[PDB]
Amino acid sequence: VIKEFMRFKPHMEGSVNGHEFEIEGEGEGRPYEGTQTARLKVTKGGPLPFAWDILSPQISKAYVKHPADIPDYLKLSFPEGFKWERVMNFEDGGVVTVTQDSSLQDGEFIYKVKVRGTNFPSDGPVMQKKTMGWEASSERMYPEDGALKGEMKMRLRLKDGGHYDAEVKTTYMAKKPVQLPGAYKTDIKLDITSHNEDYTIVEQYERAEGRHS
Ligand code: NA
């Protein structure tokens, strides 16, 4: 049911510092190669008064290259799919939580994402839009409590040349108890490849590949 080429349709809504928004789009990729692109648009609440970069990672784990000897739990979960929940704790007190449903419907993945951000400083780089994309990350993946967990520190580049850090924890839960893997690592790099001035129209690319740790 997962072909070498698969499209996906994300819908994301929520709020950051009280600012509500909705976003839609369409993407495509090669799940076994760990590669994908997407076209996103802000359909409600645009232009966003905060950095697009905090939303970009809440937008696809069926697209991670896995070696044969590591069970690809999240691909295996299809077609029913899986859900995931995330917390990002930013270094200046900003927090984002996320809940997400992923399913496979009529040959395309469907993503429903709910995002809540709060406690970002008004003069911080998120609310002032001083960010410039994520450095590559490595997510530590491990089974726990009958779910698949991921842990990573993520690094946002700043316009001034510094960095702005987040500690991130995600739980990924298949809708059926397909095979959990052992502990491993996933290397991920997300790039913003195009955007309009005020980021109401955005394109992104991500590559992700699991490996033994
Ligand atoms: Na390692």
Resolution of the experimental structure, in angstroms: 1.6
How long, in residues, is the chain? 213
List CB contacts of 98: < 8 A, sequence separation 6 or more: 58, 84, 85, 86, 87, 88, 113, 114, 115, 116
Q: What is the CATH number of the domain that holds 193?
A: 2.40.155.10
Q: What is the Cβ-side half-sphere exposure of residue 151, based on CA atoms within 13 angstroms?
A: 5
Measure 213 CA to ligand 1 centroid, in angstroms.
4
Tell me: is residue 7 an annotated ligand-binding position: yes
Q: How far is the CA of 183 from the centre of ligand 1 (A)?
A: 10
The sign of the dihedral angle between the CA atoms of 190, 183, 85, 35 is positive
CA of 73 to the centre of ligand 1 (A): 20
- For residue 139, the CA-to-ligand 1 centroid distance in Å is 10
- Using DSSP's 3-state secondary structure scheme, residue 181 falls into coil
Give the C-alpha separation, 121 to 45, whole Å: 20
Cβ burial, residue 128 (10 Å; 0-12/13-18/19+): middle
Cis preceding linkage at 79, omega within 30: yes
Q: φ and ψ at 56, to 5 degrees?
A: -55, -35
Give yes or no for a contact between 205 and 36, defined as CB atoms under 8 angstroms apart. Answer: yes
* Closest residue by Cα to residue 36 from 194, 199, 191, 195: 191
Q: Which two tokens stand for residue 196?
A: 């309009």
Distance CA 198, CA 202 (A): 9
**Interatomic CA distance for residues 187 and 134, integer angstroms:** 13
Evaluate the omega torsion of the peptide bond into residue 47 and state whether it is cis, within 30 degrees of 0.
yes
Helices (H), 5-131: 73-76
The total number of structural domains that make up the chain: 1
Number of alpha carbons in the 13 Å side-chain half-sphere of residue 38: 28
Hey, what amino acid is at 213?
A: S
- Quote the ligand 1 centre to 77 CA distance (angstroms): 26
How many whole angstroms from 186 Cα to the centroid of ligand 1? 9
Give the list of residues 6+ apart from residue 101 with CB closer than 8 angstroms, or none. 81, 83, 111, 112
Residue 133 structural domain = 1-213
Locate breaks in the chain with C to N over 2.5 A; list the residue preceding each. 59
- Say how many Å lie between the CA of residue 185 and the centre of ligand 1: 7
